[PDB]
């Protein structure tokens with residue numbers, strides 16, 4: 378009666394859950410909506426993300442993570458349980474082997490609490506791994522080889538960079554300059570340069586639709602809808618990709634600096650691997666147009682943009698199944 382393997386990518390922006398024999402059962406926003414002042418969940422995932430900034434007084438929004446850190450442990454615990462309910466499997470936790478991948482900013486205290494909760498739910502084994510380690514494996518690097526894997530993971534709450542070798546993280550660092558920061562800067566820029574008020578939904582759509590870090594073959598622009606800063610009256614304006622590219626390049630100076638900082642702290646034998654083989658890039662922001670060109674021009678090493686940039690962590694978790702199963706056989 379093989380034990381069920383359950384894997385959870387717990388992320389600031391999105392979370393993914395996988396159950397062996399079922400595949401991915403959840404791949405949606407890390408957001409919940411409750412009837413205000415009650416325990417009644419009214420939305421989870423994408424339906425809850427849509428409610429952000431669009432609620433009335435009797436709906437409120439909770440997010441288990443903010444900038445890679447747990448906001449409220451009970452909220453995080455309930456979120457995990459609601460994710461598991463999406464499986465439609467009775468007693469899904471019972472006798473299960475659970476792998477949770479989470480940001481480094483989740484404390485050991487919070488990790489142990491998640492372990493104990495899943496154990497309370499029926500799990501026979503619970504292990505917690507750093508998202509950066511799983512991302513590199515899922516994005517295709519042999520993290521187990523004695524060889525330096527150079528990873529950059531640009532998410533919503535955090536950007537992390539590190540060197541991986543021989544099954545573990547050798548050195549790493551995370552910064553707050555990531556997707557959420559970028560979209561807030563676009564919002565601020567639009568107000569400052571176009572004297573128009575927009576929200577974060579529009580700023581993110583600008584970033585996804587016309588954002589770039591290098592001039593592409595295609596010139597793009599956008600019409601956006603907002604309110605005049607002066608009159609509060611309805612207003613629409615055109616945003617050019619060139620003005621957003623200038624902004625993104627300036628913002629990404631902190632991200633190139635992070636990559637340089639990792640290299641400067643890389644042990645010398647591993648640094649030759651990082652330089653010769655180059656950078657592996659994952660996370661949702663790895664999809665920004667021209668990122669590869671931007672990084673290759675600056676660093677003059679190969680840059681691989683993961684083809685699975687948002688499922689890299691869960692895919693690593695799935696690849697890590699034998700390793701987690703061997704930890705249970707051996708704990709006997």
Ligand SMILES: Nc1ncnc2c1ncn2[C@@H]1O[C@H](COP(=O)(O)OP(=O)(O)NP(=O)(O)O)[C@@H](O)[C@H]1O
Nearest residue numbers: 388389390391532533534535556557660661662664
């Ligand atoms: N096509 C896209 N182009 C650009 N950015 C995108 C795209 N799709 C998603 N994003 C951004 O990717 C970010 C989320 O990446 P993702 O790896 O799913 O985050 P996460 O793992 O939940 N957050 P974190 O805990 O910081 O790693 C958000 O800032 C999105 O706006």
Ligand SMILES: [Mg+2]
Nearest residue numbers: 388389508532
């Ligand atoms: Mg992530």
